[PDB]
Design a binder for these strands. Structure first.
Ligand SMILES: [Mg+2]
Ligand SMILES: [Zn+2]
Ligand SMILES: [Zn+2]
Ligand SMILES: [Zn+2]
Lengths: 66, 44, 115, 528, 98, 34, 98, 521, 39, 255
RNA sequence: UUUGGCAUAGUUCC
């Protein structure tokens, strides 16, 4: 839905890295290099960014009730 | 009692024993407005 | 629905005593200590410190159920020495070790930064 | 019509006289709890606060019952009703007047279920009498029916979404009946086959073998812990086997403390050869088989499914027949707790490193498979040249199929034997197979070497299309691959035709499972 | 009313004669997950009695290669009688041979 | 002009084109339209 | 006017046929919704494909212990006009005559 | 065949069969035949060429598509009984090539042999390393996992709906999931699973879950339920009053507004009144609707409208967040189902050298008898992918993915090649003697929870015709004491318990009888 | 080649005069038991 | 029968990381300190949310749960504060909680990111760690609005995991397997530890029968709330106060 | 502090 604030396994904060990760990918980076640059060191933290599916972008399409 | 129309998003007063119609857009689906009562959430 | 609140694992309620002392009638000079609202974080230190004592013949601990917060410690000591004295000496030695460790860590921090 | 009302199931007689819905019953999910006794069940606080038992007021308990009534229906250790001698009911769910709270002997107070209450626990279907046994209530925080693990075998219950039923007897007469007749420790040995109906199940069983190996030497602190988990322990730490240069105990030296009384028994490990009993070293047993228990001490041997299991004459069976239910219950509980808390030191797992073989073994398996395929080709050539001679009592097709299936079975068994004998002493498949916990040598063979032939209705895969199994084969092809002999193991993966043939093979098992159940139930009902 | 009733209840036939009418068509769409929705929308059915002990039509025939999934099937009283299309399978719509 | 040992991408390009053209519930839609 | 016919979603005669994802989002419809179901009294209905034996073909079977040895049936239908099926059998009596 | 391939006179849907032995030609234009596309092999070379592949891979802004591929005579539709006169090849570049001659007259070729699996079985990774019953079980359990089921769930008043907080796409995915859109609406979370026997609470298909992970949002979801009521005497939506209405209960009417409907955002506990409706008894009868017992949800949305006829209509939705307890049911993508056994905090779970405690611990005894090696291979491939940065490919029949290649790839990141890792005990801090197999596997939270299954009864409501307890957990009914159970009690010999269960616990009664004629008096 | 298991149990419990696979094991007396000729 | 004489050495010290080595200590003490790092170090975090208006696409419990996990700088005032269960106030006073306020509305044609930058506290020393990017809370369309009031209590990681002050605590002893606490079926497949003192050919150190685990290696990484030196010091003082209170209660019971 | 029933479909567990 929206990127979680903490990494489930260890608790490192990954909730401030999604925009930077997407920007690095758009700037012609591989996913491994982007994750290395963002400081995500262990695979528990890396999977939080690798496997995330951002549905709030789709949810923002529909108009609000008011 | 204020209901918000589901198409034009305009709130209008509707009382009991009254057909549920919307002025100025002619819709038939109305949503209740969020309550003013305060509810406390733990942040867990 | 049947979820206990999280604070019940470390808060003594109205009536509960922290530690109760009971004797063991199977073997002479044996005693059991029941500690409420504790876990391995204290049980392990107290057991490993009791084992260092040369006048302690038995020293163990166990958690009877992981869903119920309670620690049982059993210590048997040689005659002319009591398990209560062994327990109190163990706690005092642990406190002394921790105080010394904190002092040395603080001086190491001071050496590391601006030094 | 009235005949329809009385006719069959859901009809009056057979649906409301021979079986009917009852009060004081609960049903929720069951989850494991190795910290309970054999005859205990964990109950959520909601169910206990909802179910009640009527206790008669006497001078021995009037103060306690009055305090329960004072607590009332809100607080869990409370009560719901007060029943007068005349029979008129007094409510306690709301706020009552202080006058009705008066209690005198001869009254009845319907208190909430508490610890130590006796209940009957059941899992449907109820096949044998070990499916409805009496348990002792213990109240636990969350909301599932916690129950021990050795009691899994009587119920045939695993903890994947299962549910079980709770029935609470309401009178002292029926409570004493259930206590003296249907309690769990009293049903350890079944009268169906005079064997113990419950035994160690697969996790204490995969670990007691490792505990009882010769190598296990225990430090002083580890012995302290394990003895701390023993409920039937005298209080004296035994002399260590190894006394210098460092005091070391042994796994057998502590299982001896677990074993009760003075039990004499002689079993045999599951890897005991056929020469030790004959040649020399009969009583020395280089591989540490030939379990011997003298005077309640494990002198020698490795404990496995054949010693602690649910077979006739096992160690648990001897313990029952010699000591009684009250001591066999403690036997089970102590074995489980001690072995689990030791397993917290040794650990256990299963992985790809445990499912992978060696290059020499792969070469052996591939050679055997190629030889078998060549032999099948030769048999087919001889049959085509009409040189095959029929076996008496068999048709030409029957004898050809028998020869082909025999060759392929020999190939599969030889590859399986190679895979077995190429294992290691640290392999976790071997750990879970030798100890009898879960698995089999055929499963190890299918994982490592060869899945094997797939059969439909007892015959090879039939010709679904016009004279061929799939559109990828020529017509009239009787090779091993055409009719569904999977040459690959589960680790290497199956080619698409073998995948489809394997699915066709597994469908038969699913169908038989879904079919046999109703007929078995009907046969049992007719016999009853 | 006829079309609405037959689609609403699933008894494929007239209301007066819902005895021999074959029930089980027109189920209510599953919405637990997207995979549930898709596998519901691509589903077959064999009208063989679910209590029939003879289980030859319940087996996996050789001719289901690429037409019907070899794995996806319910378990219980309808094992092998409810099936699902393969991924690339198509069903003809019909024409006339003029 | 053969496609040798580059097949593991060609086959999936073909399959992707199939599912872009048709979809997953084309049978119901086509049957009702007809 | 002879009545109202239910319409399958996303089909050629629905209001969502051919619309883009932005229009679907405007109508509060999920662009990922596959369609292919009816809306009957609010609920969503799905027709389940029903298997049946092929028509207009001659099949020769045999029965276990019946009077005839071999049978042959031709389930006949006419271009989905009417008269659903008419299964004519051409049997052959067994050799166990008394 | 030439005319059908040109698509000139005969539509591509028509099938043609020649029975060479029996001298018959059969042509079908019928509706209902099931068919699948196949590639065409002319002599020994596919008619599909690199020019076709390039024109397809430029599919955008080129109006070249599957129809333009079919119209070129490259692919073809083959129904079931035309497949009996065709020779197929599973893989072009492997079966068309020169070998020891098996068949040199191939007539078609398979696009990819993994297109024989359905929608629900296309999500299993490495299904060719599994067992067929396990694949069937996963096909069953894939329709019960909880994830976002549709993107416009906020305007749907569905009777029951379940949506996960933070779904993730698999780190080990099949190539054919892009067509099922499992990347866009997934259902599950990648969890660090360790296969070990820790404290005995995962025995017999149970799961130990990290409670600290759960506190951070792991496998949390919402539950939406909708209620409806219309005013079909004179039923009216209105707020009842205790001392003016005939029918009444022990519930609270103070939540309602003037017209008798709860406004959204109002927390309602079990056994409350959502919609208040009253019938004018010819002086008012209460027919209010009550929350299903013990929900404890918050009103989410209220919709007021008119039904077909013209009576006022209302649908009210209630939400309740479901935090995974110790009774909830979880399953992976390999037919391994289990319920939570107990939850440990982070300080108690075993840890690696780098402080990576597992999210889930599963028993090692589940593997040897079930033979789900796809589970282990998925774990290994996920451990490689989470470090490398790619997303692993687990399409069934590959020949370019081996356990050896995966292990070699994993050894280059500092880990043991076969996946094991030295863990430390949580309570004591000591190393565990046996190394544990740990890695990120993709788990699912099934629909079956414990709060929707717990049920108890002690003297509740009673049926009308038989005066026996009701049936149904929603109606506070009892548990049936069937004939098998009474036979078991007969075998036990507990005559008094059996009589209590069949007479006293259920309906007791008294009658009078005449001593002369056995007829009730 | 006989019937075992659930069908056999069904037949033995509800005895029918027409079993699915009736059989008759026969033992020979003398030299017919050993020599294949009289066998 | 007496205490040990532990010694420390800090290998690396940065703004989010401390690596040190404890020596001459028992494994039980080292592991107890390791456990106390995670669980019993007090931290300030949001524990009471009241949502005035939420027209966003996430429900109120979702937003509150996200708010709870935003770390607040409690470097110096975590000791001054009191537990709310231990305070004389009615519900909340400045001596036992910190109040936050969020009020964001979107009136533009571009999606707006509500971040932790928008949380405003009354006390200037308790602010989100991304306020000297930002932790995203929710995204708003045009016309959507969020507004709430939140209170930040004091607690530690045994109660909830939002009060856990650490990210990953790496603990390791005896990098070369000289004590044989773990047994390798094949010792040469296993990568050498970071602190190994072996050559490129030898895989395991030779067995040492008369040895006990000493020289534990730590690596405490902080999640931004406390700084990674005060995490260690508060653990040594926090464990020391648990033992002292046990000794007080034992002395009453004995007498 | 009072009690609807019939049918069909799907699912869980042996
Ligand atoms: Mg089960
Ligand atoms: Zn992490
Ligand atoms: Zn309007
Ligand atoms: Zn205060």
């Amino acid at each position: 839905m929206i990127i979680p604030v903490r990494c489930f396994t260890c608790g490192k904060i990954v909730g401030n890295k999604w925009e930077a990760y997407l920007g690095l990918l758009q700037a012609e980076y591989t996913e491994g290099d982007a994750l290395d640059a963002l400081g995500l060191k262990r695979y528990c933290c890396r999977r939080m960014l690798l496997a995330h599916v951002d549905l709030i972008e789709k949810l923002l399409n529909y108009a609000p009730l008011e | 009692m204020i209901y918000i129309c589901g198409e034009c998003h305009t709130e209008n007063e509707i009382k009991s024993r009254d057909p549920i119609r919307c002025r100025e857009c002619g819709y038939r689906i109305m949503y209740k407005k969020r309550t003013k009562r305060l509810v406390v959430f733990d942040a867990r | 629905m049947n979820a206990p609140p999280a604070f019940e694992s470390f808060l003594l309620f109205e009536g509960e005593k922290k530690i109760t002392i009971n004797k063991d009638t199977k073997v002479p000079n044996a005693c059991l200590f029941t500690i409420n609202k504790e876990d391995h974080t204290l049980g392990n230190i107290i057991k490993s410190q009791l084992l260092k004592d040369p006048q302690v013949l038995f020293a163990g601990y166990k958690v009877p159920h992981p869903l119920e917060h309670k620690i049982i410690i059993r210590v048997q000591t040689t005659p002319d020495y009591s398990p209560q004295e062994a327990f109190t000496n163990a706690i005092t030695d642990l406190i002394s070790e921790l105080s010394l460790l904190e002092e040395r860590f603080r001086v190491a921090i001071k050496d590391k930064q601006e030094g | 019509s009235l005949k329809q009302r009385l006719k069959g199931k859901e009809g009056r007689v057979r649906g409301n006289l021979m079986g009917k819905r009852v009060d004081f019953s609960a049903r929720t999910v069951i989850t494991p709890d190795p910290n309970l006794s054999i005859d205990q069940v964990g109950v959520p606080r909601s169910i206990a606060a909802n179910m009640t038992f009527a206790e008669i007021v006497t001078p021995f308990n009037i103060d306690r019952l009055q305090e329960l009534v004072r607590r009332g229906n809100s607080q869990y250790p409370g009560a719901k009703y007060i029943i007068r001698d005349n029979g008129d009911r007094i409510d306690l769910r709301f706020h009552p007047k202080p006058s009705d709270l008066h209690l005198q002997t001869g009254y009845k107070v319907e208190r909430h279920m508490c610890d130590g209450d006796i209940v009957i626990f059941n899992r449907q279907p109820t096949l044998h009498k070990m499916s409805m046994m009496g348990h002792r209530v213990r109240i636990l925080p969350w909301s599932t029916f916690r129950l021990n693990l050795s009691v899994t075998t009587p119920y045939n219950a695993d903890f994947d979404g299962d549910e079980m039923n709770l029935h609470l007897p309401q009178s002292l007469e029926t409570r004493a009946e259930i206590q003296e007749l249907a309690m769990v420790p009293r049903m350890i040995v079944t009268p169906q086959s005079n064997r113990p109906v419950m035994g160690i199940v697969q996790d204490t069983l995969t670990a007691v073998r490792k505990f009882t190996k010769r190598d296990v030497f225990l430090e002083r602190g580890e012995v302290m812990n394990l003895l701390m988990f023993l409920s039937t322990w005298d209080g004296k730490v035994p002399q260590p086997a190894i006394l210098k240069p460092r005091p070391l105990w042994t796994g057998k030296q502590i299982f001896s403390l677990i074993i009760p009384g003075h039990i004499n028994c002689i079993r045999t490990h599951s890897t005991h050869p056929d020469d030790e009993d004959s040649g020399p070293y009969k009583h020395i047993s280089p591989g540490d088989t030939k379990v011997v228990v003298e005077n309640g001490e494990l002198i020698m041997g490795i404990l496995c499914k054949k010693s602690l299991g649910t077979s006739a004459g096992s160690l648990v069976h001897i313990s029952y027949l010699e000591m009684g239910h009250d001591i066999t219950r403690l036997f089970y509980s102590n074995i489980q707790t001690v072995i689990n808390n030791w397993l917290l030191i040794e650990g256990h797992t299963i992985g790809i490193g445990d499912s992978i073989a060696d290059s020499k073994t792969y070469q052996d398996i591939q050679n055997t498979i190629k030889k078998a395929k060549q032999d099948v080709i030769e048999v087919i050539e001889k049959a085509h040249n009409n040189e095959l001679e029929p076996t008496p009592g068999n048709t030409l097709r029957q004898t050809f199929e028998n020869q082909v299936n025999r060759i392929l079975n020999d190939a599969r068994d030889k590859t399986g034997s190679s895979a077995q004998k190429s294992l290691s002493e640290y392999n976790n498949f071997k750990s879970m197979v030798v100890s009898g916990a879960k698995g089999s040598k055929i499963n190890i063979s299918q994982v490592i070497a060869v899945v094997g032939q797939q059969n439909v209705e007892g015959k090879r895969i039939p010709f679904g299309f016009k004279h061929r199994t799939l559109p990828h084969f020529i017509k009239d092809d009787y090779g091993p691959e055409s009719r569904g002999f999977v040459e690959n193991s589960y680790l290497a993966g199956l080619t698409p035709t073998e995948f489809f043939f394997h699915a066709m093979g597994g469908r038969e098992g699913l169908i038989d499972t879904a079919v046999k159940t109703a007929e078995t139930g009907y046969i049992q009902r007719r016999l009853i | 009313d006829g079309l609405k009733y037959s689609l609403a209840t699933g008894n494929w036939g007239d209301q007066k004669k819902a005895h021999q009418a074959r029930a089980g068509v027109s189920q209510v769409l599953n919405r637990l997950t997207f995979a549930s929705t898709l596998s519901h929308l691509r589903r077959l059915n064999s009208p063989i009695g679910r209590d029939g002990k003879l289980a030859k039509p319940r087996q996996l025939h050789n001719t289901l290669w690429g037409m019907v999934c070899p794995a996806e099937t319910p378990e219980g009283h309808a094992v092998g009688l409810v099936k699902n299309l393969a991924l690339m399978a198509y069903i003809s719509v019909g024409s006339q041979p003029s | 002009e053969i496609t040798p040992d580059l097949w593991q991408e060609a086959c999936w390009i073909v399959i992707s084109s199939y599912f872009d053209e048709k979809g997953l519930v084309r049978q119901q839609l086509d049957s009702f339209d007809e | 006017f002879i009545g109202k016919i239910p319409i399958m979603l996303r089909s050629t005669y629905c209001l969502l046929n051919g619309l883009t994802d932005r229009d679907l989002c405007e109508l509060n419809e999920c662009p990922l919704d596959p369609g292919g179901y009816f809306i009957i009294n609010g609920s969503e209905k799905v027709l389940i494909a029903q298997e049946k034996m092929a028509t207009n073909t001659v099949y020769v079977f045999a029965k276990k212990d019946s009077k005839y040895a071999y049978t042959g049936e031709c389930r006949s239908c006419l271009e989905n006009s009417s008269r659903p099926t008419s299964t004519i059998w051409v049997s052959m009596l067994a050799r166990g005559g008394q | 065949r030439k005319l059908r391939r040109q698509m000139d006179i005969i539509v591509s849907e028509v099938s043609m069969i020649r029975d060479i032995r029996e001298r018959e030609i059969r042509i079908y234009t019928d509706a209902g035949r099931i068919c699948r596309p196949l590639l065409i092999v002319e002599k020994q070379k596919l008619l599909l060429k690199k020019r076709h592949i390039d024109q397809l891979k430029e599919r955008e802004y080129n109006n070249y598509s599957w129809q333009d591929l079919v119209a070129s005579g490259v692919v073809e539709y083959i129904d079931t009984l035309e497949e009996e006169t065709v020779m197929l090849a599973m893989t072009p570049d492997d079966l068309q090539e020169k070998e020891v001659a098996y068949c040199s007259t191939y007539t078609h070729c398979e696009i990819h042999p993994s297109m024989i699996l359905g929608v629900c079985a296309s999500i299993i990774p490495f299904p060719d390393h599994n067992q067929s019953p396990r694949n069937t079980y996963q096909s069953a359990m894939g329709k019960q996992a909880m994830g976002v089921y549709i993107t416009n769930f906020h305007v749907r008043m569905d009777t029951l709906a379940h949506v996960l907080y933070y779904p993730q796409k698999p780190l080990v995915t099949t190539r054919s999931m892009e067509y099922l859109r499992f990347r866009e609406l997934p259902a599950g979370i990648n969890s660090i699973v360790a296969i070990a026997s820790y404290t005995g609470y995962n025995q017999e298909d149970s799961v130990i879950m990290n409670r600290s992970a759960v506190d951070r949002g792991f496998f949390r979801s919402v539950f939406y339920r909708s209620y409806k009521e219309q005013e079909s005497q004179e039923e009216v939506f209105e707020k009842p009053t205790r001392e003016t209405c005939q029918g009444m209960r022990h519930a609270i009417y103070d939540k309602l507004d003037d017209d008798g409907l709860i406004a959204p955002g109002v927390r309602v506990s079990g056994d409350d009144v959502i919609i208040g409706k009253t019938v004018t008894l010819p002086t008012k009868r209460d027919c209010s609707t009550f929350l299903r017992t013990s929900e404890t949800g918050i009103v989410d949305q209220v919709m007021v409208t008119l039904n077909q006829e013209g009576y006022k209509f209302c649908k009210i939705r209630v939400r309740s967040v479901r935090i995974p307890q110790i009774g909830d049911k979880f399953a992976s993508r390999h037919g391994q189902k289990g319920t939570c056994g107990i939850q440990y905090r982070q300080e108690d779970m075993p840890f690696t050298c780098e402080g990576i405690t597992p999210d889930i611990i599963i028993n090692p005894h589940a593997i040897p008898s079930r033979m789900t090696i796809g589970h282990l291979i998925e774990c290994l491939q996920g451990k490689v992918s989470a470090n490398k940065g790619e997303i692993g490919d687990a399409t069934p029949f590959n020949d370019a993915v081996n356990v050896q290649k995966i292990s070699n790839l994993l050894s280059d990141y500092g880990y043991h090649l076969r996946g094991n890792e030295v863990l430390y005990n949580g309570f004591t801090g000591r190393k565990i003697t046996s190394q544990i197999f740990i890695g990120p596997t993709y788990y699912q939270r099934l629909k079956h929870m414990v709060d929707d299954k717990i049920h108890s009864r002690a003297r509740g409501p009673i049926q009308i015709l038989n005066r026996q307890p009701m049936e149904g957990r929603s109606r506070d009914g009892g548990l049936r004491f069937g004939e098998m159970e009474r036979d078991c009690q007969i075998a036990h010999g507990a005559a008094q318990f059996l009589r209590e269960r069949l007479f006293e616990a259920s309906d007791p009664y008294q009658v009078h009888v005449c001593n002369l004629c056995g007829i009730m008096a | 080649n006989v019937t075992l298991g659930v069908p056999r149990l069904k037949e033995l419990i509800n005895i029918s005069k027409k079993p699915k696979t009736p059989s008759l094991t026969v033992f020979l007396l003398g030299q017919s038991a050993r020599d294949a000729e009289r066998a | 029968p007496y205490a040990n004489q532990p010694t420390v050495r800090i290998t690396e010290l940065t703004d989010e990381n401390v690596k040190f080595i404890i020596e001459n200590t028992d494994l039980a003490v080292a592991n107890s300190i390791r456990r106390v790092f995670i669980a019993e170090v007090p931290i300030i975090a949001i524990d009471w949310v009241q949502i005035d208006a939420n027209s966003s696409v996430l429900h109120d419990e979702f937003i509150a749960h996200r708010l709870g996990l935003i770390p607040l700088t409690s470097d110096d005032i975590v000791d001054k504060l009191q537990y709310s269960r231990d305070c004389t106030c009615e519900e909340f006073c400045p001596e036992c909680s910190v109040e936050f306020t969020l009020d964001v509305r979107c009136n533009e044609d571009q999606t707006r990111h509500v971040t932790s930058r928008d949380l405003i506290s009354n006390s200037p020393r308790v602010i989100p760690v991304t306020s000297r990017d930002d932790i995203l809370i929710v995204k708003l369309r045009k016309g959507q609005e969020l507004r709430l009031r939140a209170y930040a209590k004091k607690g530690f990681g045994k109660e909830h995991a939002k009060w856990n002050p650490t990210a990953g605590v790496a603990f390791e002893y005896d990098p070369d397997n000289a004590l044989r606490h773990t047994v390798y079926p094949k010792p040469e497949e296993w990568p050498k530890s970071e602190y190994s003192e072996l050559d490129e050919d030898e895989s395991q150190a030779p067995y040492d029968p008369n040895g006990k685990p000493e020289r534990f290696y730590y690596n405490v990484e902080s999640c931004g709330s406390l700084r990674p030196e005060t995490i260690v010091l508060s653990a040594l003082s926090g464990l020391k106060k648990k033992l002292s209170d046990l000794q007080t209660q034992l002395s009453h019971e004995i007498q």
